[PDB]
Amino acid sequence: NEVVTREYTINIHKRIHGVGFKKRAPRALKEIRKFAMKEMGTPDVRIDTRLNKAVWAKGIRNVPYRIRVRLSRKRNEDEDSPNKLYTLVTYVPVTTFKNLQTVNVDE
Amino acid sequence: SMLRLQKRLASSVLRCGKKKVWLDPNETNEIANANSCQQIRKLIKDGLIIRKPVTVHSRARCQKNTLARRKGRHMGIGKRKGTANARMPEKVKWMRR
Amino acid sequence: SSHKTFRIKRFLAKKQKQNRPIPQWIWMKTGNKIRYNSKRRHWRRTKLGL
RNA sequence: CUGCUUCUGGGUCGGGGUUUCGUACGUAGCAGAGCAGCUGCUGCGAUCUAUUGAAAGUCAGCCCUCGACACAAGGGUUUGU
RNA sequence: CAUGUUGGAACAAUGUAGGUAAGGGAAGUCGGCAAGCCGGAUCCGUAACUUCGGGAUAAGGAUUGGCUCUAAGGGCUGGCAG
RNA sequence: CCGCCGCAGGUGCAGAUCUUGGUGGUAGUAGCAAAUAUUCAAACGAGAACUUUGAAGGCCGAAGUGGAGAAGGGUUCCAUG
């Protein structure tokens, strides 16, 4: 019902378009957080360190155009925020994003 | 909470910079109540505070490039900035002869 | 500097021991009028002479 | 200035179309100044040729999807002759 | 080391600091101011004038990558070997 | 503390770009723009853009933002709160 895990590919290239060279990789982290908030409706998003490294792999100016992201709504653990559930945004290494749909994986 | 004391000490015991001292992020509380060097020397041996290895500066392509220079590649007219004298002076030749 | 004279180091020694706050049993006295130590001497702000 | 269910609508991703650049990596070759090493096979070699108008990007303020994937009848503040 | 005593969101005018511009080319302007050209090395070539030292990197040209060879320039042990 | 009768004066303020102190409008305005840059999780904690740790990305690039001193400073050192 709520504890859902679903795959997405995020076109960062058209969420990052026009923004300055010293704010492309930092911006890209916010439209994976804005993206995570939009689909899996939790104002609490917590993004993985491996997914950070993937965005900063080509430095700050150059960012991967398309990225593959497993998005997982989990229950929020004790010391509860007003948010009852959070999203864990984990990286999925992909060779080519060609003919990749948004996959509803199961646990 | 605060580990600035025990990155300075550890660096002064390991004889590296605090650039290289690896304080165990999951064992934060065991490092924070060391408060002295005798207690840090335990936490070197017990494998918490670890000396990170040197960031690799390989001169493998340098060696590979210089083996082309020994053959006389990258040594044409468009790779000479300094004069015939500045590159290999006449007095040093006349000395050799 | 590091290189000091015994007269200057004695001068600095006095100006350290004068640079402490009031004891908090002094304001519980009868004819008490002292709130804080007015002659407290910080090392950025006032430069001690010399 | 617009959109927020005619059982449908926008969003996202994918695919098309468009278009930009100019032929990807790998692999193969009796192609390659040669040179080294083995008695014609074997290394090294920029480059060239084929695969390959290939590869890559393409709305973020490009075009068409009817293909996946969720999501969408909700919240807030006010207003009476 | 953590951007120099702050962040976030935008990307208007006017700035400040960098660029680029078709065709013309100083017509701009007090005035080529600012900008731009030129620029390293190697090989040629170098005028007036000169106090014979200079002028001089005058001026003016050609060349420059990558690869793959060829030749030349040496130590050391017993006109040649190792 | 004051009325009346005398006495005495450092005896009456709006000003002097007066003196001292206080408070306005401007105004929640100008501003917080020199030397490329931050980002992710976690910890402590009432509280994190700034602390600490880890991982990443960068900078100084040995005529350094590095390691030591002299002048000068004088406790700024170090720990803990």
Curated annotation (Swiss-Prot), chain A:
It is found in: Cytoplasm. It comes from the Eukaryota. The modification N6-succinyllysine is found at K38, K53, K58. Keywords: Acetylation, Cytoplasm, Phosphoprotein, Ribonucleoprotein, Ribosomal protein. GO terms for molecular function: structural constituent of ribosome. InterPro entries: Ribosomal_eL31 (IPR000054), Ribosomal_eL31_CS (IPR020052), Ribosomal_eL31_dom_sf (IPR023621). Component of the large ribosomal subunit. Belongs to the eukaryotic ribosomal protein eL31 family. This is Large ribosomal subunit protein eL31. The gene is RPL31.
